[PDB]
Design a protein around this ligand. Structure first.
Ligand SMILES: CCCCCCCCCCCCCCCCCC(=O)OC[C@H](CO[C@@H]1O[C@H](CO[C@H]2O[C@H](CO)[C@H](O)[C@H](O)[C@H]2O)[C@H](O)[C@H](O)[C@H]1O)OC(=O)CCCCCCCCCCCCCCCCC
Ligand code: CLA
Ligand code: CLA
Ligand code: CLA
Ligand code: CLA
Ligand code: CLA
Ligand code: CLA
Ligand code: HEC
Ligand SMILES: CC1=C(/C=C/C(C)=C/C=C/C(C)=C/C=C/C=C(C)/C=C/C=C(C)/C=C/C2=C(C)CCCC2(C)C)C(C)(C)CCC1
Ligand SMILES: CC1=C(/C=C/C(C)=C/C=C/C(C)=C/C=C/C=C(C)/C=C/C=C(C)/C=C/C2=C(C)CCCC2(C)C)C(C)(C)CCC1
Ligand SMILES: CC1=C(/C=C/C(C)=C/C=C/C(C)=C/C=C/C=C(C)/C=C/C=C(C)/C=C/C2=C(C)CCCC2(C)C)C(C)(C)CCC1
Ligand code: OEY
Ligand SMILES: [Cl-]
Ligand SMILES: [Cl-]
Ligand SMILES: [Fe+2]
Lengths: 137, 341, 36, 442, 334, 82, 34
């Protein structure tokens, strides 16, 4: 098996438009997710709130839906709770809160697309393992 | 003085590497076993037999490479290259696990060769054959663990695979399934290995700190001559010391050095017997009295019951991936788990 | 017989290993087996 | 009569060559401290925590107040540069002096000068060299006082508002505090000198030790060992080395515990959280999350019957529950706002937890000092992804190993120095074996 | 002729059937205390809340244990690293429930054992010997410190020190493997090499000396009677033994210098056991064995398992089950 | 003390020794190198390449499950890649 | 006068020749990308 454009094709928004990443973008996304996110989200879980994972099925039921590039890019700017009812940039890394999460200072808009792209690809490769926890290690 | 005596002459000539009649059996087998293992760990997968990568070529390092065992579907096939499974196709031979039996069997005959070499050299040099005798312990361990144990089980699949981490997995397997630490035959093996290592260290230290001053330098090593008749350390002072420190001491150098042979050799022979039992799943798994009480009395807890919970965790969490031919599907809800973890 | 000094043969075998072994550790972080 | 592998023992009675060896060796230590700092600086990224970056020298410099501002934010890397450069440059000078005295210089000193030359058995000369270095050491300790009081201060993790660099105006002089620490138990909740938790006490102890070392240096220059010390010790170079080995071993064991438990002179801001700290922070993290969902953490019974989030210590204090009950002696600036007289205050927990405290708990919990040798962060069952081993594990483990071997070095050289001094280190004299003139035991 | 000088002379006497000495003045009482408390706790101690979760574990013979399952149980996790002497308890009843005897026993034993090592230096000095037998014993001593003191210090609790019992020992090993992947740590691998090789070279040396015993007896008597205690002549032929071993392998892989050989014997297991004691002591600060979990992946990013991942499956089953009631939060950080 | 073979210390410091072996040792190393870089090692031994452990949309091990048909089984999987 | 080709000679090259070949194979391997 290989990293084909089919697997690298993820939704861009809720309207159904899609977008095909490159292998460069994917690896860039994986690297940046490691730099900025894996300390809490290694393998797609959330170590400090295990009830909320990065599984695509979970992102899809989030309010604003988050199972697309746009929703993920917006989340990294202005994160909300799962019902979208409150903004949580003071306890969650975002560009809005890069003053207090300094690792977000040097992330460009294109870095965000890659991070978001990696999150949407990875369950297409790993399956249950992504967001499933130690049961699937 | 016909051909056979001429050949004996040549085989037994004093050269940098003695050959002997035992060399005919030892040298090809030792070399093929060694070469099979280096070949397998450099180039050969375990994908079709285990679903594992296991060679340098595949991305593995020295700790994770292995020559893995054949698939459970091979039963105890000898997996001869020219046999019905591989049918003389080298490549399939490799992918079905033929290199494992290759290494096991050639290793076994190499081990025989080596012990015959100890016999042969000792007869020619004129010494007693105790080093050959001592080597019976490694042989017993090897046949019991690599041959007898898988032969009692369903297949070679459950023998140890030739690899650092693969052997680690074999250790943990035996804890989780056989409760092997509870086995008094293993415990005698432990006391023989640790007792040997203790004897080794305490004997070397003792000699080195009861040395006679036989030269003038701070390096005491130069002051020994291999043809000197005199003992090089004081047995009298060594005995006083250990008598006053520990209460008892060796007083007979012959017994002491026979004891050093005895302890580790015996210990290994004992563990081999335990492994023969485990061939049949004849385990020292439980203490019945403990289980009767615990089932009835839910406040009764020992280190014995705590260790079986751990075994139960090991079995359920490793079985699906470690025994893939069984197609075990354990849904999340059936996995045994303490709180939170 | 003794034309090459042994210490020099020893020094140069020596770095020869350090190089091959260091390549093998570099390889633990690149490519196959690096987790990336 | 030593072999090559015991080759430095040939230097015992060559004072000029032995001097070159020490001074060349001092150059290597200064070299590494310079090279390593520059290596760390060339790798440093200021937007990452120091402890996600494998730094152990830059944190020692930040802790002295150089380069950091409020909350440990790095404001200026130039001080780091300077420290590295100056060490590195200075190593050439020590290197120069070491190879000069080791190769070209006088092989022995005692003919060239009676001041610099020495004989190991000259108890007076020996205690004078001791006194000189004690004065040096005492001056060293006062430099730390000088920095703290007069040249910019020190980083204070306990300062209000995130921690910050602070000048120390009232160093603790009260000997009841200062030596109080030296008589605290080393067990949990006490922690001997490792419990020091404010810069006033740190600086005050260095005033004291600085005075004590100068006083003792003058004492040892002016005096000669009294008879009871004369008859208690072995007076030889190898004996003296074994004494220092013993002492370095002990100090190494102490430094190991300092870096593992102490979050004051090893700010967690720079070094990462302690083990207890991370463990406490996990309980805090889930206390917070669960209470936001409506859980009454005060009244929640856990499976054991003990509280799920909060329970009592054996002496009654309200503490975090779960396995972290073991760590309830932990004190840190992100937690203490919640402590009342009886321990954690349930009313402050329900009302006064601040976002910064939520952040710091989430951060420390996800940076517990657990990781693999190949720097995979976290418990041994974690998958690869996070490249992290705490500075604290690195510093604690290395120094336990070093401290251990030096105790072994102490035993080796102490036993040899005794045997050499009595004349049987090369073995038993066949013609005069002491056991053969002793009566039998039975 | 002074009373103190006469006492000093008995203390340090080389005529005492067992040598006392100044280290012995501390060793004798501390090992007596630890021994007597151990024997009584092993037989009759009531169950101990090792993990602080009010779930007492029964360790003694009269509470339903056998020799294999019995143990003196570590002191409560609720105590952590606090000093818990008898006089700190409201009653012996409380001290027993909370694991007090474990602390009493191990502190006295570590002291007495430390003094045991000093005592070996001391007698060696009194008898005119070289001094380093105590250095060999520092290897097992270090190892006991690691499992009784160092590891609890790093993990924050004597409840995670090693139980004083056979099955308790195995529990400690399994929990250790789950949290530290000790099998994959180089310092444990060196310990195995020091201990396998120790036993190897024990057998080798014992067999080589035994093989070259000089004929001094008839076949109807133990060859052992061919040696008389204190004879000056060696009792075997080292050149015959070297002549056999150097031909079994090749000449230069054999010792003919008895000193270098016996020093080799001392060094190999001592150094290997130092490392494995250092391994325990450094995993006490959570610097664990190599982690190759998911290190091989395919061109797509599928994980390709290796034997290390299988180990991890075993490790997880040990993780999720140990101290099954003691964890309320999802990471076992200590 | 000697069995008549030429001492190694004498050989590996000999100019003739290094004349021959400064060719043989690199030649062997390059050959080993090329066994891998050409891909021949994969084919000789049956080792999957990074792209050929699984077919594209698949996460089942091609595990051998028959003893006497195992040869044919492996080829059935290899053809599920081409 | 020593002989070049001996049993010793064969034992050595029977190990040394494949060793260097495998080392070259293993060196190449470090540059394989997935
Ligand atoms: C002369 C000869 C010497 C003879 C001495 C004989 C008596 C010695 C007694 C030694 C017993 C040591 C046990 C230490 C146990 C422990 O809790 O020790 C750790 C303590 C630190 O204690 C901890 O100290 C902490 C201090 O931190 C507190 O304050 C901090 C302030 O920053 C933070 O706020 C932190 O959160 C807060 O909790 C807490 O109080 C903890 O509860 C407390 O456990 O360290 C210590 O006191 C530092 C020193 C301990 C040395 C231990 C090393 C011993 C091992 C060497 C073995 C070598 C083996 C050789 C064999 C061959
Ligand atoms: C002393 C050396 C030695 C020994 C004991 C073995 C032993 C073994 N090898 Mg190894 N092997 C060796 C050397 C050795 N090998 C060498 C030198 C090579 C490299 C060429 C190999 C390569 C090799 C491979 C590639 C394989 C083995 C295998 C085996 C096993 C099966 C052998 C078998 O069935 O024999 C059967 C044959 C005999 C027992 C010979 C008996 C001869 C009798 C006495 C005379 C018969 C007369 C004859 C038939 C008349 C000819 C008729 C003609 C005129 C028409 C066994 C463990 C197999 C294995 O490990 O399984 C996985 C396997 O696949 N060997
Ligand atoms: C920190 C490590 C250290 C240091 C400082 C020393 C220092 C010393 N050793 Mg020891 N030694 C060491 C490690 C060390 N040793 C180790 C690891 C071993 C085991 C192999 C030995 C084994 C050993 C033996 C066997 C002997 C010594 C001896 C000596 C002394 C005489 C050296 C001599 O004549 O060399 C002459 C060598 C040279 C002229 C070669 C060049 C060496 C120079 C100094 C290299 C410097 C390089 C540097 C890049 C230059 C920068 C200079 C610039 C700043 C200007 C010297 C003081 C000897 C002694 O005690 O004499 C009585 C002796 O017999 N040593
Ligand atoms: C003595 C204390 C000490 C400590 C605690 C550290 C700790 C650290 N160093 Mg530093 N370092 C030291 C001495 C020390 N070093 C010395 C002496 C050198 C010169 C060789 C270096 C050169 C150095 C470099 C060049 C780098 C580090 C890096 C690191 C980090 C990762 C280490 C790692 O993965 O090793 C893996 C573990 C080992 C190699 C195990 C060693 C086992 C030894 C051989 C056993 C010996 C037993 C006896 C003593 C870590 C923060 C890295 C980093 O993150 O930099 C920012 C990095 O790139 N260090
Ligand atoms: C502690 C280390 C140490 C010790 C004990 C000695 C001792 C000695 N050296 Mg060596 N030397 C050293 C370090 C040391 N030196 C260093 C570091 C270098 C390189 C610069 C040299 C280079 C050197 C040379 C080139 C020569 C000696 C010679 C001598 C002898 C006479 C020196 C004299 O008359 O002083 C004169 C006294 C002074 C100059 C006193 C003024 C105050 C000092 C220099 C400043 C102290 C500042 C501070 C404490 C340290 C630096 C600050 C830093 C932390 C930033 C004497 C035996 C001579 C010899 O053996 O001839 C045969 C000789 O020729 N030394
Ligand atoms: C590097 C430091 C150093 C060294 C090596 C020495 C070495 C020496 N000193 Mg000096 N001394 C020093 C610093 C040092 N001193 C300082 C700073 C002072 C000023 C306070 C003094 C004041 C001083 C006096 C007043 C005397 C010496 C004397 C001596 C000699 C005998 C020492 C002795 O028997 O100790 C062995 C110590 C004991 C038998 C008593 C032990 C008491 C301790 C506190 C017990 C605690 C042990 C515990 C486990 C460790 C933890 C600490 C605890 C408090 C928490 C010896 C040459 C004596 C001498 O002959 O001078 C001419 C003497 O009378 N020293
Ligand atoms: C302040 C530190 C110190 C000092 C000055 C000395 C000084 C001395 N020692 Mg002691 N020693 C020490 C610490 C120290 N020791 C420690 C900590 C131990 C326990 C480990 C010992 C154990 C010891 C023994 C057993 C012996 C000495 C001996 C000696 C004498 C000769 C040593 C020699 O030539 O080494 C020469 C140097 C070497 C042979 C090099 C050793 C190389 C080490 C083991 C490798 C470490 C590698 C490292 C972990 C990094 C790995 C990376 C890799 C790339 C290399 C000399 C008086 C000898 C003696 O009694 O003479 C009087 C002796 O027999 N020492
Ligand atoms: C690196 C920039 C990232 C990215 C891309 C994400 N995180 Fe986090 N995260 C954390 C916690 C506690 C939560 C739950 C928040 C809540 O609802 O209270 C989250 C949640 C997310 C989501 C939403 C998941 C969903 O199923 O809806 C996403 C998409 C997300 N995060 C992305 C905790 C952390 C951290 C702990 C310190 C860190 C670091 C990150 N997250 C980093 C990142
Ligand atoms: C199987 C088989 C076979 C055979 C084969 C062979 C015989 C092989 C060989 C092989 C070999 C023969 C190989 C080799 C290799 C080797 C190697 C690979 C090496 C390695 C090395 C190393 C890596 C090392 C390193 C080091 C270190 C680390 C430290 C110390 C030093 C040193 C250097 C040692 C045949 C054909 C019959 C057929 C059947 C199959
Ligand atoms: C005696 C002896 C010995 C020893 C030796 C030694 C140890 C030495 C030392 C020495 C030393 C210790 C050295 C040092 C050096 C240094 C140097 C020479 C420096 C330089 C510097 C520089 C040049 C810098 C520059 C810079 C700057 C300024 C800035 C930044 C960048 C840079 C870095 C570039 C031995 C053992 C070997 C052998 C025997 C004898
Ligand atoms: C700085 C500081 C501080 C302070 C500190 C101090 C002040 C110190 C002290 C210290 C000291 C004060 C110490 C001491 C020590 C001592 C010792 C360590 C000793 C020992 C001794 C010995 C070793 C002996 C021996 C012997 C014997 C017993 C017998 C006879 C013989 C002899 C002599 C051998 C504090 C914490 C506050 C804070 C922080 C900082
Ligand atoms: O391994 Mn797992 O980690 Ca050291 O603590 Mn947390 O659980 Mn418990 O008490 Mn004994 O054991
Ligand atoms: Cl458990
Ligand atoms: Cl918990
Ligand atoms: Fe012996």
């Amino acid at each position: 098996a290989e990293l084909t454009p089919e697997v690298l094709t993820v939704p861009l928004n809720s309207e159904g438009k899609t977008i095909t990443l490159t292998e460069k973008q994917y690896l860039e996304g994986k690297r940046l997710f490691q730099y900025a996110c894996a300390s809490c989200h290694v393998g797609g879980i959330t170590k400090t709130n295990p009830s909320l994972d990065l599984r695509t099925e979970t992102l899809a039921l989030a309010t604003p839906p988050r199972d697309n590039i746009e929703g993920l890019v917006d989340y990294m700017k202005n994160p909300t709770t799962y019902d979208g009812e409150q903004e949580i940039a003071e306890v969650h890394p975002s560009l809005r809160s890069a003053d207090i999460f300094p690792k977000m200072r040097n992330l460009t808009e294109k870095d965000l697309v890659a991070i978001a792209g990696h999150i949407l690809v990875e369950p297409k490769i790993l399956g249950d393992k992504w967001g499933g926890g130690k049961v699937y290690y | 003085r016909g051909w056979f005596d001429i050949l004996d002459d040549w085989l037994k000539r004093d050269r940098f590497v003695f050959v002997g009649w035992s060399g005919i059996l030892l040298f090809p087998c030792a070399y093929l076993a060694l070469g099979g293992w280096l070949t397998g760990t450099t180039f050969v997968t375990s994908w079709y037999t285990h679903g594992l990568a296991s060679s340098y070529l595949e991305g593995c390092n020295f700790l994770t490479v292995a020559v893995s065992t054949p698939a459970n579907s091979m039963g105890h096939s000898l997996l001869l290259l020219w046999g019905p499974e591989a049918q003389g196709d080298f490549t399939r031979w490799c992918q079905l696990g033929g290199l494992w039996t290759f290494i096991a069997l050639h290793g076994a005959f190499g081990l025989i060769g080596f012990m015959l070499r100890q016999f042969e050299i000792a007869r020619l040099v004129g010494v007693r054959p105790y080093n050959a005798i001592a080597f019976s312990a490694p042989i017993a361990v090897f046949v019991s663990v690599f041959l007898i144990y898988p032969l009692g089980q369903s297949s070679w699949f459950f023998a140890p695979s030739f690899g650092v981490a693969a052997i680690f997995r074999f250790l943990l397997f035996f804890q989780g399934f056989h409760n092997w630490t509870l086995n008094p035959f293993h415990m005698m093996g432990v006391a023989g290995v640790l007792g040997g290592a203790l004897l080794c260290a305490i004997h070397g230290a003792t000699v080195e700190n009861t040395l006679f001053q036989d030269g003038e330098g701070a390096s005491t090593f130069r002051a020994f001559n291999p043809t000197q008749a005199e003992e090089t350390y004081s047995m009298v002072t060594a005995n006083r010391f250990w008598s006053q420190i520990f209460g008892i001491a060796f007083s007979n150098k012959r017994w002491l050095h026979f004891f050093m042979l005895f302890v580790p050799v015996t210990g290994l022979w004992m563990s081999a017997i335990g492994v023969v039992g485990l061939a049949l799943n004849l385990r020292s798994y439980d203490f019945i009295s403990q289980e009767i009480r615990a089932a009835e009395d839910p406040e009764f807890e020992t280190f014995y019951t705590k260790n079986l919970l751990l075994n139960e965790g090991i079995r359920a969490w490793m079985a699906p991936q470690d025994q893939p031919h069984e197609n075990f599907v354990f849904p999340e809800e059936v996995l045994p788990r303490g709180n939170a973890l | 017989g003794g034309r090459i000094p042994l210490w020099i043969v020893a020094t140069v075998a020596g770095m020869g290993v350090i190089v091959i072994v260091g390549l093998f550790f570099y390889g633990a972080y690149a490519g196959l087996g690096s987790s990336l | 009569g030593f072999a090559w592998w015991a080759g430095n023992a040939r230097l015992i009675n060559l004072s000029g060559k032995l001097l070159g060896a020490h001074v060349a060796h001092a150059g290597l230590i200064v070299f590494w401290a310079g090279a390593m700092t520059l290596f760390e600086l060339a790798h440093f990224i200021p937007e990452k925590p120091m402890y996600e970056q494998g730094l152990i020298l830059i944190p020692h410099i930040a802790t002295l107040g150089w380069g950091v501002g409020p909350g440990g934010e790095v404001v200026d890397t130039f001080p780091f540069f300077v420290v590295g450069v100056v060490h590195l440059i200075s190593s050439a000078v020590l290197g120069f002096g070491g190879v000069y005295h080791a190769i070209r210089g006088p092989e022995t000193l005692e003919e060239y000068s009676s001041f610099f030359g020495y004989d190991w058995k000259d108890k007076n000369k020996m205690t004078t060299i001791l006194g000189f270095h004690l004065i040096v050491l005492g001056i060293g300790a006062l430099l730390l006082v000088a920095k703290a009081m007069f040249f910019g201060g020190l980083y204070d993790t306990w300062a209000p508002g995130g921690g910050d660099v602070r000048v120390i105006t009232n160093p603790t002089l009260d000997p009841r505090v200062i030596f109080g620490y030296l008589l605290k138990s080393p067990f949990g909740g006490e922690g001997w000198i490792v419990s020091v938790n404010n810069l006033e006490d740190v600086v005050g102890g260095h005033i004291w030790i600085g005075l004590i070392c100068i006083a003792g240096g003058i004492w040892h220059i002016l005096t000669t060992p009294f008879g009871w010390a004369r008859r208690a010790f072995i007076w030889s170079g190898e004996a003296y080395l074994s004494y220092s080995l013993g002492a370095l071993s002990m100090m190494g064991f102490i430094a190991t515990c300092f870096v593992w438990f102490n979050n004051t002179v090893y700010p967690s801001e720079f070094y990462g959280p302690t083990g207890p700290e991370a463990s406490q922070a996990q309980a805090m993290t889930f206390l917070i999350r669960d209470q936001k969902l409506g859980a009454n953490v005060g009244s929640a019974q856990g499976p054991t019957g003990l509280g799920k989030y909060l329970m009592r210590s054996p002496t009654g204090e309200i503490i975090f529950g779960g396995e972290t009950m073991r760590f309830w002696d932990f004190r840190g600036p992100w937690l203490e706002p919640l402590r009342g007289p009886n321990g954690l205050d349930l009313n402050k927990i329900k009302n006064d937890i601040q976002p910064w405290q939520e952040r710091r708990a989430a951060e420390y919990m996800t940076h517990a000092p657990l990781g693999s040798l190949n720097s995979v962060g976290g418990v041994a069952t974690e998958i690869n992804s996070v490249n992290f081993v705490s500075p604290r594990s690195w510093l604690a483990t290395s120094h336990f190993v070093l401290a251990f071997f030096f105790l072994v070095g102490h035993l080796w050289h102490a036993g040899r120095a005794r045997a050499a001094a009595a004349g049987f280190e090369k073995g038993i004299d066949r013609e005069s074996e002491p056991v053969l003139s002793m009566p039998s035991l039975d | 002729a002074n009373l103190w000088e006469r006492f000093c002379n008995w203390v340090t006497s080389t005529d005492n059937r067992l040598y006392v000495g100044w280290f012995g003045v501390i060793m004798i009482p501390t090992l007596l205390a630890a021994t007597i408390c151990f024997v009584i706790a092993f037989i009759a101690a009531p169950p101990v809340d090792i993990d602080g979760i009010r779930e007492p574990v029964s360790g003694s013979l009269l509470y339903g244990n056998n020799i294999i399952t019995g143990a003196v149980v570590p002191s409560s996790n609720a105590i952590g690293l606090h000093f818990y002497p008898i006089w700190e308890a409201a009653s012996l009843d409380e001290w027993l429930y909370n694991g007090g005897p474990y602390q009493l026993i191990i502190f006295h034993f570590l002291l007495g054992a430390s003094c045991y090592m000093g005592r070996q230096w001391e007698l060696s000095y009194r008898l005119g010997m070289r001094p380093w037998i105590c250095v060999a014993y520092s290897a097992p001593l270090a190892s006991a410190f690691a499992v009784f003191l160092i590891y609890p210090i790093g993990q924050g609790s004597f409840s995670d020190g090693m139980p004083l019992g056979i099955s308790g020992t195995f529990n400690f090993m399994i929990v250790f493997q789950a949290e530290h992947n000790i099998l994959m740590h180089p310092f444990h691998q060196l310990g195995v090499a020091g201990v396998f090789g120790g036993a190897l070279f024990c057998a080798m040396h014992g067999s080589l000396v035994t093989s070259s015993l000089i004929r001094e007896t008839t076949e109807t008597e133990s060859a052992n009677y061919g040696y008389k205690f204190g004879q000056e002549e060696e009792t075997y032929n080292i050149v015959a033994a070297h002549g056999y071993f150097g031909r079994l392998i090749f000449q230069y892989a054999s010792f003919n210098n008895s000193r270098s050989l016996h020093f080799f014997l001392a060094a190999w297991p001592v150094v290997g056991v130092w490392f494995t004691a250092l391994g325990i002591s450094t995993m006490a600060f959570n610097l664990n064995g190599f982690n190759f979990n998911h290190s091989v992946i395919d061109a797509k990013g599928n994980v390709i398992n290796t034997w290390a991942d299988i180990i991890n499956r075993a490790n997880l089953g040990m993780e999720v089950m140990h101290e099954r009631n003691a964890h309320n939060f999802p990471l076992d950080l200590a | 003390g000697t069995t008549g073979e030429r001492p190694f210390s004498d050989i590996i410091t000999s100019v003739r020794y290094w004349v021959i072996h400064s060719i043989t040792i690199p030649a062997l190393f390059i050959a080993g190198w090329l066994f891998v870089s050409t891909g021949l090692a994969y084919d000789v031994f049956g080792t999957p390449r990074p792209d050929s452990y699984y077919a594209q949309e698949q996460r089942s091990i091609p595990l051998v499950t028959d003893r006497f048909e195992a040869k044919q089984q492996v080829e059935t999987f290899l053809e599920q890649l081409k | 006068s020593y002989p070049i080709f001996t049993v010793r000679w064969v034992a050595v090259h029977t190990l040394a020749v494949p060793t260097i070949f495998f080392l070259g194979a293993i060196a190449a391997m470090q540059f394989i990308q997935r």
